[PDB]
Each structure stands twice: as C-alpha cells, then as structure tokens.
Amino acid sequence: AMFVPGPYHAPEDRWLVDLVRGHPLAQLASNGAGGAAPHITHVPIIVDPELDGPVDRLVGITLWGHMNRANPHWAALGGAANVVATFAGPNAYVSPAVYRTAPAAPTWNFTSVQVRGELRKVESADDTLATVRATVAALESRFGAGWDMTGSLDYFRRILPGVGAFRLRVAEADGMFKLSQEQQPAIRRRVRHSFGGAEATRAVAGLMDRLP
Amino acid sequence: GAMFVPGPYHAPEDRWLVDLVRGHPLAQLASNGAGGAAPHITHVPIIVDPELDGPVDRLVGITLWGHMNRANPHWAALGGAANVVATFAGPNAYVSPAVYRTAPAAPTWNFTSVQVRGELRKVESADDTLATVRATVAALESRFGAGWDMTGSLDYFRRILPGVGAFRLRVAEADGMFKLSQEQQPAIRRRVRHSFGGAEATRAVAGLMDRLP
Ligand code: HEM
Ligand code: HEM
Ligand SMILES: O=C(O)[C@@H]1CCCNN1
Predict the structure, then answer these.
(1) Distance from Cα B133 to the centre of ligand 2, integer Å
(2) A47 Cβ neighbours under 8 A, 6+ residues apart
(3) In angstroms, what CA-CA distances link A3 with A66, A82, A145, B68?
(4) Which residues of chain B neighbour A151 with C-beta distances below 8 Å?
(5) Residue A80 lies in a domain
(6) Helix (H, G, I), strand (E, B), or coil: what is residue B153?
(7) Quick check: is B204 in a domain?
(8) Binding site membership of B109 for ligand 1 (Cβ less than 6 Å)
(9) Is the peptide bond between B39 and the residue preceding it cis, with omega within 30 degrees of 0?
(10) Yes or no, beta carbons of A103 and B4 under 8 Å apart
(11) Phi/psi of residue B155, each to 5°?
(12) Which of A27, A80, A125, B23 could be disulfide-bonded to A86 (CB atoms 3.0-4.6 Å)?
C-alpha cells in the first residue's frame, strides 16, 4: 500500500518502530467523501503503552492517538474508517556537488513510516483520559524536560470532553529509508561525510552510518 | 473548510503559506484509496510555477509542478483528474509545560503545515516532463544545494527520463496551520520563544514566533 523501492527498505522491522517513537506528530489521512481529496490532520500518535517487552514490529500492535472532536475529520471518520498515518523522520536535500561525479541528478533523502488499518473512536471517558496521560508520559520522556503532570490531572479532566481519542490496529506498515543506498559505496560515504558537518543533516548522516 | 485550523493559528499573511511551500518542497501527496481503502500517500518534490513573475503572495489560483515515479502504483491510481491534497510540513517542536513555568497546563506540539487541494493533471509529453525536472533542479539546488551546475547532466536527464511522472496541480484551496503558542498569554509565549532560540533544532520555530505581530 506504500511504494518503497527495494534499496530503501529498513534493515530491521525495529527501524519503523524507532521512527514512530521519534516522530509522533503523524499526518492522519482518510478518504474524502464523493471523490473529494483526503482529510489530513496532524495528530500525536504513540505505541500502545501497555506493551511490556521490546516492540520490534508495528504490524499487529495498536497505536493510540487523539484529535479535536470539533475537527470535521472526526465526524468524517465514521465508525470503521480505513486510515493511513504517516510519520516523517530526518530528511535532507542531496546536491550532486557532494557526489563529485558526473553526470548526476539531485534527490531528497528522507525517512517515512506509513501505517494502515481500522481507526476505532474511543468513547469511554476513562480510556480518553488514559490516552492523553500516556501521550504526556511518552512525549515528555523523549522530547521534554521532566514536567510532572500530577498537579494538572484535574485540568485534564476539565478539558477532556473536547478530546477525540482513537485506536489504530496496525494491519500494514511500510518504511521508506531513502538514504543514498542506490549510489556506489564511495558516493554514499561522500554524502554521509557531507551531512556530518551541519545540524540540519546530522540525523540523516546518523541513519546512513547505521546501514549494514 | 477542507483543513481544520483554529482561529489563533491562522498565518498573519497569505505570503507565509507560499514561504512554507518554498521552504519545504518534499510534500505528502494524498489521494483516495479505491473501494474504501486508506489513501495513497507519496513524498514528492513540488515547486511553484517557475513562469510566475511579480511577488507571489497567494497559493490559490497558481499552478504547482511536481513529479513522482511512474513505477509507483499511486501514479496509475491517480488516473485522470484526481482531487488531491499536498501537505507541506515546516518547522515544529514539542512544547514542555516545564518551559511555561505555570500550573496547571498540558503539553503541545508547535508545528506548521500547508495543505493545498485541487485537481492533479498528468503531464505526458517528454518536453514538459524534462521542463518539470529541470525547473525543480533550478529551484531546489539554488535554495538547498551546494552550487551544483546541471549543465554537464542535461543530456543525462533526457537519458533517464521515462520513469518520471510529471504533474501540475492548480490550487483551488490552500489552508495553513501555524501552531506557534498564540493561545498562551504573552509572557508564556515569550518563554517558549526564548526556550526554542536556545537550540539549533528549535531555532526555526523561534524565528516564526518572533515574526508574529
Ligand atoms: C502530550 C502531548 C500532547 C500533544 C502533542 C497534543 C496535541 C494535540 C493536537 C495536535 C490537537 C489538535 C488535533 C486536531 O487538529 O484535531 C490536540 C487536540 C486536543 N487535545 Fe491534545 N495533545 C497533547 C496532550 C493533551 C492532553 C494531556 C490533554 C488533556 C485533556 C489534551 C486535550 C486536547 C483537547 C481538549 C483537544 C481538542 C481541543 C483543542 O485542541 O484545544 N491534549 N492535541
Ligand atoms: C531536484 C531535485 C529532485 C528531487 C528532490 C527529486 C525527488 C524525487 C522523488 C522523491 C522521487 C520518488 C517519487 C515516488 O516515490 O513516486 C522521484 C522520482 C524520480 N525522479 Fe526525481 N527529483 C529530483 C530531480 C530529478 C531530476 C533532475 C531527474 C531527471 C530526469 C529526476 C528523475 C526521477 C526519476 C526517473 C524518478 C523515477 C524513480 C527513480 O528512478 O528514482 N528527478 N524524484
Ligand atoms: O495542543 C493544544 O494546544 C491543545 C491544548 C492542550 C494540549 N492538547 N490540545
């Protein structure tokens, strides 16, 4: 359901899980009614926080998300919507100047995970509050500064009615790791070296370093 | 509208949406899946019509150019006059309530997004396919590159051209999400802006926050 050329497959299933954890603000897409363009909403999605033990594969697990119930996308999902959620990681423009070869064409290195399955809306106030608390736990740990939600739990309950929490059972998962694997080894090394020298591109260089 | 954007997160000026498209040309192109399936999503390079002169302040009514792989099933799936959305994602950063130094609070994610909607029309001519990719080099190498000169590769482009699926997208609708702490009180907005200015990873978000009225 996602087109990934052979050379851009992750070396291990765990790479797709690592991208979802590192880039939780996903683009959630569902079909537009009457041949209209898809609905797209940026939503915070995490892996099922009740999974204990290493999560090596996305297929078969449940993701947890929320959006604004007042967003018209929530009404458009209906009951049993087949959805895609796209997670986008590190990326960078590849200048052929870096290759020091000729002839050439530029490209864009990038990382994507597309997960597909059925979206189920959460109606339970308990499950909705679990969703947003788990999201805080996961994102404050990875991206934040040790903020303690304990003193804000009453506030969470006060604004809870606006939350559209959901569950996405992952039927299909595809990962684009477009990282110059199509180039000859010395050229891949020149790209990696070039991306090492600047903050905007170091995370791409980091992934290129981890390919077998 | 086709994109949900709370009032506080509207761009100050139409120009902000054009700027984000120019800044973040690798868009997520979405069209409907067949028979209830989830949408097809492809990352594709997309540029403003290179023939526009004058300041470009508004996306609505301009044509965007882009290309993708013909081998990608998404190309066949678009068929004729497919209604599509292309989403451009700019600077973004998680907002810890630790930065607010206020209670109670909840975290958020500051982010920027432009969604353009209209009818994708395929280019089938080799001449307009070659134009598409040469215009894309000119626009992207200048903005993101390292002074590469395509001159030596102009014939090479023609020698690798058949796999290119070039397209045009006339923008019927453009919506912009500029989620940049506009909902917070001014003193809290300033604390987020100063926190984001203290690391290169978040400086671009701080830059946009600094340009709000
Ligand atoms: C932990 C990080 C969190 C992030 C990144 C986050 C992000 C978001 C985003 C992006 C939306 C808008 C979705 C749309 O456009 O429909 C949203 C909506 C909402 N979220 Fe969260 N959220 C988080 C935690 C929470 C918490 C802890 C609560 C507590 C109840 C909460 C309550 C809401 C509510 C009420 C809305 C809908 C109304 C509104 O957006 O103001 N969120 N959230
Ligand atoms: C200027 C920057 C460029 C960028 C960022 C870029 C980006 C891309 C991307 C992301 C794809 C894959 C789309 C998909 O999954 O369907 C694509 C496909 C393609 N591009 Fe470009 N493109 C660039 C310039 C060029 C140029 C100058 C040529 C010359 C003909 C070209 C030839 C192709 C071809 C043949 C394909 C089909 C698949 C393949 O062979 O890789 N591109 N391009
Ligand atoms: O993201 C926001 O700004 C709103 C308020 C608090 C956290 N999630 N919804």
Answers:
(1) 8
(2) A17, A20, A21, A55, A61, A63, A64, A138
(3) 27, 18, 38, 11
(4) 103-104
(5) yes
(6) helix
(7) no
(8) yes
(9) no
(10) no
(11) -75, -35
(12) A27
Whether B64 is in the pocket of ligand 2, judged by its Cβ within 6 Å, is no
Contact (CB, 8 A) for A187 and A84: no
Closest chain B C-alpha to A14 CA, distance in angstroms:
22
Q: Could you tell me if B32 and B39 are in contact, meaning their C-beta atoms sit under 8 angstroms apart?
A: yes
Q: Is the CB of A108 under 6 A from ligand 2?
A: yes
Tell me which amino acid residue B32 is.
Answer: N
Q: Which residues of A touch B141 (CB under 8 A)?
A: 95, 106
Please tell me the total number of residues recorded for chain A in this structure.
212
Q: Give the number of whichever ligand sits closest to the CA of residue A2.
A: 2
Would you say residue A158 lies in a domain? no
Closest CA to B84 of B40, B46, B124, B53: B40
Say if strands B164-170 and B82-95 run parallel, antiparallel, or are unpaired: unpaired
Verify whether ligand 1 is closer than 6 Å to residue A68 (CB atom).
yes
In a domain, B1, yes or no: no
Q: Which of B83, B94, B111 sits opposite A32 (nearest CB)?
A: B83
Best A39, A40, A77, A191 residue to mutate vs chain B (most B CBs within 10 Å): A40
**SS3 state of residue A87:** strand
Q: Is A98 helix (H, G, I), strand (E, B) or coil?
A: coil
- b/e per residue, B58-96, with b = 16+ CB within 10 A? ebeebebbbbbeeebebbebbeeebbbbbbbbbbbbbbb
* Elucidation method: X-ray
CA-to-CA distance for B213 and B127, rounded, in angstroms? 45
**CATH code for position B121:** 2.30.110.10
Instruction: Give nearest CA residue, ligand 1 atom 6.
Output: B108
What is the phi/psi pair of residue B178, to 5°? -115, 80
Cβ contact (<8 Å) for B109 and A30?
no
- The count of other CB atoms within 10 Å of the CB of residue A206 is 13
- Is B92 annotated as contributing to ligand binding? no
How far is ligand 3, taken at its centre, from the CA of residue A45, in Å? 14
Residue-number span of the structural domain to which A204 is assigned: 6-124+164-210
How many CA within 13 A on the CB side of residue A118? 5
Q: Which ligand is nearest to the CA of A164?
A: 1
Residue B164 Cα to ligand 2 middle (Å)? 7
Q: Do A168 and A118 contact (CB within 8 A), yes or no?
A: yes
- Please tell me the total count of domains within chain B: 1
- Provide the residue count of chain B: 213
Q: What is the resolution of this structure in A?
A: 1.7
